[PDB]
Design a protein around this motif. Structure first.
Motif, PDB file in Angstrom:
ATOM      1  N   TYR A  34       0.832  -1.197   0.000  1.00 53.23           N
ATOM      2  CA  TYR A  34       0.000   0.000   0.000  1.00 53.23           C
ATOM      3  C   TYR A  34       0.874   1.257   0.000  1.00 53.23           C
ATOM      4  O   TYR A  34       0.579   2.239   0.682  1.00 53.23           O
ATOM      5  N   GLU A  50      -9.913  -2.084  13.917  1.00 47.00           N
ATOM      6  CA  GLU A  50      -9.608  -2.829  12.709  1.00 47.00           C
ATOM      7  C   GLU A  50      -8.325  -3.646  12.814  1.00 47.00           C
ATOM      8  O   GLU A  50      -7.300  -3.180  13.315  1.00 47.00           O
ATOM      9  N   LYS A  67     -15.337  -6.553   6.111  1.00 46.88           N
ATOM     10  CA  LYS A  67     -14.275  -5.984   5.275  1.00 46.88           C
ATOM     11  C   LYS A  67     -14.611  -6.337   3.827  1.00 46.88           C
ATOM     12  O   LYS A  67     -15.275  -7.322   3.588  1.00 46.88           O
ATOM     13  N   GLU A  69     -12.852  -7.119   0.277  1.00 44.94           N
ATOM     14  CA  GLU A  69     -11.627  -7.346  -0.495  1.00 44.94           C
ATOM     15  C   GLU A  69     -11.906  -7.468  -1.974  1.00 44.94           C
ATOM     16  O   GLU A  69     -13.040  -7.688  -2.382  1.00 44.94           O
ATOM     17  N   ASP A  93     -10.366 -13.316   6.592  1.00 43.42           N
ATOM     18  CA  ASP A  93     -10.044 -12.091   7.305  1.00 43.42           C
ATOM     19  C   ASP A  93     -11.126 -11.858   8.359  1.00 43.42           C
ATOM     20  O   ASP A  93     -10.826 -11.433   9.467  1.00 43.42           O
ATOM     21  N   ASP A 214      -5.189 -14.305   8.902  1.00 46.72           N
ATOM     22  CA  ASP A 214      -5.417 -15.232   7.803  1.00 46.72           C
ATOM     23  C   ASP A 214      -4.179 -15.332   6.945  1.00 46.72           C
ATOM     24  O   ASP A 214      -3.303 -14.468   6.983  1.00 46.72           O
ATOM     25  N   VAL A 452     -14.659   5.246   8.506  1.00 49.39           N
ATOM     26  CA  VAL A 452     -14.126   4.100   7.783  1.00 49.39           C
ATOM     27  C   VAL A 452     -13.633   3.099   8.819  1.00 49.39           C
ATOM     28  O   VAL A 452     -12.778   3.429   9.658  1.00 49.39           O
ATOM     29  N   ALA A 457      -7.647  -2.184  -1.322  1.00 50.97           N
ATOM     30  CA  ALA A 457      -7.181  -1.416  -2.462  1.00 50.97           C
ATOM     31  C   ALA A 457      -6.590  -2.286  -3.583  1.00 50.97           C
ATOM     32  O   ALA A 457      -5.834  -3.239  -3.356  1.00 50.97           O
TER      33      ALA A 457
HETATM   34  N1  LIG Z   1      -9.250   1.810   1.403  1.00 47.59           N
HETATM   35  C1  LIG Z   1      -9.056   1.499   2.684  1.00 47.59           C
HETATM   36  N2  LIG Z   1      -9.841   2.021   3.634  1.00 47.59           N
HETATM   37  C2  LIG Z   1      -9.681   1.700   4.906  1.00 47.59           C
HETATM   38  N3  LIG Z   1      -8.737   0.858   5.288  1.00 47.59           N
HETATM   39  C3  LIG Z   1      -7.910   0.293   4.393  1.00 47.59           C
HETATM   40  C4  LIG Z   1      -8.056   0.608   3.045  1.00 47.59           C
HETATM   41  N4  LIG Z   1      -7.131  -0.070   2.381  1.00 47.59           N
HETATM   42  C5  LIG Z   1      -6.441  -0.792   3.265  1.00 47.59           C
HETATM   43  N5  LIG Z   1      -6.912  -0.566   4.486  1.00 47.59           N
HETATM   44  C6  LIG Z   1      -6.389  -1.176   5.736  1.00 47.59           C
HETATM   45  O1  LIG Z   1      -4.966  -1.351   5.675  1.00 47.59           O
HETATM   46  C7  LIG Z   1      -4.627  -2.448   6.543  1.00 47.59           C
HETATM   47  C8  LIG Z   1      -3.969  -3.533   5.689  1.00 47.59           C
HETATM   48  O2  LIG Z   1      -4.850  -3.906   4.628  1.00 47.59           O
HETATM   49  P1  LIG Z   1      -4.750  -5.369   3.969  1.00 47.59           P
HETATM   50  O3  LIG Z   1      -3.376  -5.617   3.492  1.00 47.59           O
HETATM   51  O4  LIG Z   1      -5.876  -5.535   3.017  1.00 47.59           O
HETATM   52  O5  LIG Z   1      -5.003  -6.335   5.228  1.00 47.59           O
HETATM   53  P2  LIG Z   1      -5.578  -7.821   5.002  1.00 47.59           P
HETATM   54  O6  LIG Z   1      -4.360  -8.665   4.377  1.00 47.59           O
HETATM   55  O7  LIG Z   1      -6.119  -8.408   6.248  1.00 47.59           O
HETATM   56  O8  LIG Z   1      -6.675  -7.719   3.828  1.00 47.59           O
HETATM   57  C9  LIG Z   1      -5.953  -3.000   7.073  1.00 47.59           C
HETATM   58  O9  LIG Z   1      -6.303  -2.342   8.293  1.00 47.59           O
HETATM   59  C10 LIG Z   1      -6.907  -2.596   5.949  1.00 47.59           C
HETATM   60  O10 LIG Z   1      -8.244  -2.547   6.450  1.00 47.59           O
END
Ligand SMILES: Nc1ncnc2c1ncn2[C@@H]1O[C@H](COP(=O)(O)OP(=O)(O)O)[C@@H](O)[C@H]1O
Ligand SMILES: [Mg+2]
Ligand SMILES: [Mg+2]
Ligand SMILES: [Mg+2]
Length: 581
Positions: A34, A50, A67, A69, A93, A214, A452, A457
């Motif tokens: 990210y 979260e 959540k 995905e 998750d 997970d 949120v 993403a």
């Molecule tokens: N667009 C978003 N809005 C809010 N939180 C986000 C967003 N994108 C990512 N996050 C947060 O960033 C952190 C890491 O995301 P992620 O890698 O998807 O975790 P996971 O592997 O459990 O899906 C988590 O808290 C996820 O909810």
């Protein structure tokens, strides 16, 4: 990433080994890192707690964990395995937070009805025993070679059983169980997944789960490094204790493998024996793979050979791209950019994509509604407006978020939180669009007061130079007493609101929607006022709707009300039809 390797090489003060190389290729890749959204995200108003999914308090006793995905790239390649796997992971998750999966909500964006995606989702959903309470289907050629598959999962967990996605104290052990690890990701099955759910919860009851995460992109690597990094700790990962599907795998393979149906549990050493017993009993493969420690290093061992060792934090944190301040322009007006309007009733039925088989009201009316008890329940809505977003990125996103609040209120629910998925094109080639999005969402939340809770993403969604329409899919959580929820009956139909839009009077429309919902009226809030699904589901009750719909376009502030009496509110109200038989 080029920028990113010389950064790595800078930090490591040497050329990475083959393993490190692999390990960072994942942890530092957009998906896991990210690097373009970290900053834009931290900006968004948060809430709850979260971890691997936002957990929202629903009544001080129970909390809903959810959540949303995406599975865009894996679905583009393979539709069936793409969809089903997205369903597999997001549900994990939710599982990893200590909540039992209770609903799967769809969000498909395609050039056509790809039967592969819809079934992959239905099948898997049915095989684990988790209903697909609702969904959203958007058709457009703009998504021709880039299908967007946003799957949302949700569950219920008692607040005194919430499980953390982190390691808390030097000395705990991390267990990996569920499917066996094999050369997957250099094919998931719900039966296993089901055992994982039934097996995980089991352990959770016995207080045998003190931390969890997970297994997804990154396999044993990501889950262990992030479990310890989130708690500023370390780990001594013993790769030879990971149960293998194919026994002749190299350390780096085991480590980075991305086999499905697998979970990581952080617990006390004295509890492992039981974790492995509940695990084996449910036909799963487990073992005590890693051990949390105080020195913040991530040391990966095989048997006695050192496979790799790096500052856990260097792994957890990926280089952060800068942010770009987007300054909202005046709101422009959109034109009928159309999304084909395709009817897939008998298709959804052919593949058992029932969408709403156990809700207080058929999800065909927008907002799904689930019970937690006689008078306790929550709502789920998934919205998005790329048709407007295409035209204008900031305002099209801001609007999807507002229109979600309506849907949420049209069922009697109080908005509690938002989960969102960021479906964008290339951030580097056009970093402004992205900021226009995040900012739109930053503002909309500060405007509605809805925070949120979690999100996802998916960037770089391009087809030979072409970026997809900017698509932020909104996943809103509402609170609501089922008993008070309104069911359709014979009544007159009204048009409440304006045929146009005006950010200020959005709250006056929310205000009217509340007055009416509470007076027992049945409301509908969709950009088209009335559609196929709506009409069709009214038949379910033996109701024939007959109305003369005014014309909105293409972003209005009007809903349709169905009550005995005429709506008395401080907003335009015009009678327009019936609903009888
Ligand atoms: N667009 C978003 N809005 C809010 N939180 C986000 C967003 N994108 C990512 N996050 C947060 O960033 C952190 C890491 O995301 P992620 O890698 O998807 O975790 P996971 O592997 O459990 O899906 C988590 O808290 C996820 O909810
Ligand atoms: Mg992650
Ligand atoms: Mg995770
Ligand atoms: Mg994940």
């Amino acid at each position: 990433k080029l920028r990113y390797l010389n950064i790595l090489k800078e930090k490591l003060g040497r050329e990475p080994t083959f393993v490190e190389l692999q390990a960072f290729s994942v942890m530092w890749s957009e998906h896991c890192g990210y690097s373009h959204t970290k900053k834009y995200i931290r900006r968004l108003p948060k809430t709850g707690f979260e971890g691997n999914a936002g957990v929202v308090n629903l009544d001080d006793y129970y909390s809903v964990a959810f959540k949303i995905e995406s599975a865009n790239h894996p679905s583009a390649i393979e539709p069936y395995n793409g969809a089903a796997t997205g369903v597999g992971g997001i549900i994990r998750d939710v599982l990893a937070m200590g909540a039992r999966p209770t609903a799967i909500f769809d969000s498909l964006h395609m050039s056509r009805i790809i039967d592969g995606i819809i079934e992959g989702i239905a099948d898997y959903g049915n095989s684990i025993g988790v209903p697909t309470v609702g969904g959203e289907l958007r058709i457009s050629s703009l998504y021709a070679h880039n299908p967007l598959v946003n799957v949302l999962a949700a569950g219920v967990v008692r607040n005194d059983m919430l499980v953390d996605s982190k390691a808390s104290r030097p000395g705990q052990v991390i267990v990996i169980f569920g499917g066996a690890t094999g050369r997957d990701g250099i094919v998931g099955d719900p039966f296993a997944e089901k055992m994982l759910i039934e097996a995980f919860l089991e352990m959770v009851e016995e207080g045998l789960v003190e931390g969890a995460q997970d297994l997804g992109a990154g396999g044993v690597l990501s889950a262990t490094s992030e479990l310890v990094a989130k708690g500023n700790l370390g780990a001594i990962v013993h790769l030879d204790r990971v149960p293998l599907r194919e026994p002749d795998m190299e350390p780096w393979e085991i480590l980075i493998s991305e086999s499905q149906e697998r979970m990581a549990v952080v617990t006390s050493p004295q509890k492992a024996s039981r974790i492995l017993e509940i695990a084996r009993k449910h036909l799963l493969f487990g073992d005590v793979v890693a051990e949390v420690i105080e020195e913040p290093v991530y040391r990966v061992m095989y048997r006695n050979d050192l496979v790799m060792e790096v500052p856990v934090q260097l792994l957890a944190n990926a280089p952060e791209e800068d942010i770009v301040e987007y300054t909202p322009g005046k709101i422009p007006e959109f034109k009928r950019v159309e999304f084909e309007e395709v009817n897939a009733r008998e298709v959804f039925e052919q593949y058992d994509h029932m969408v709403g088989t156990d809700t207080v009201v058929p999800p065909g009316f927008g907002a799904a509604v689930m019970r937690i008890k006689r008078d306790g329940g929550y709502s789920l809505v998934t919205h998005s407006r790329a048709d407007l977003a295409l035209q204008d990125t900031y305002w099209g996103t801001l609007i999807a978020v507002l229109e979600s609040v309506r849907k949420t209120l049209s069922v009697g629910a109080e908005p509690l939180a938002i989960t969102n998925c960021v479906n964008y094109g290339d951030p580097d080639v056009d970093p402004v669009g992205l900021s226009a999005m995040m900012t739109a969402l930053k503002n909309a939340c500060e405007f509605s007061g809805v925070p949120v809770a979690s999100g996802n993403a998916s960037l770089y969604n391009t087809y030979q130079g072409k970026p997809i329409p900017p698509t932020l899919v909104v996943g809103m959580l509402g609170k609501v007493n089922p008993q008070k929820v309104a069911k359709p009956k014979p009544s007159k139909v009204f048009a409440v609101g304006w045929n146009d839009f005006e950010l200020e009077r959005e709250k006056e429309l929310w205000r009217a929607i509340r007055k009416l919902s509470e007076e027992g009226a049945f409301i509908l809030s969709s950009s088209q006022l009335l559609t196929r699904t709506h009409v069709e589901t009214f038949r379910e009750y033996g109701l024939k709707i007959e109305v003369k719909l005014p014309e909105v376009r293409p972003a209005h502030q009007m809903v349709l009300v169905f009550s005995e009496r005429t709506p008395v509110v401080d907003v335009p109200v015009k009678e327009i039809g019936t609903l009888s038989r």
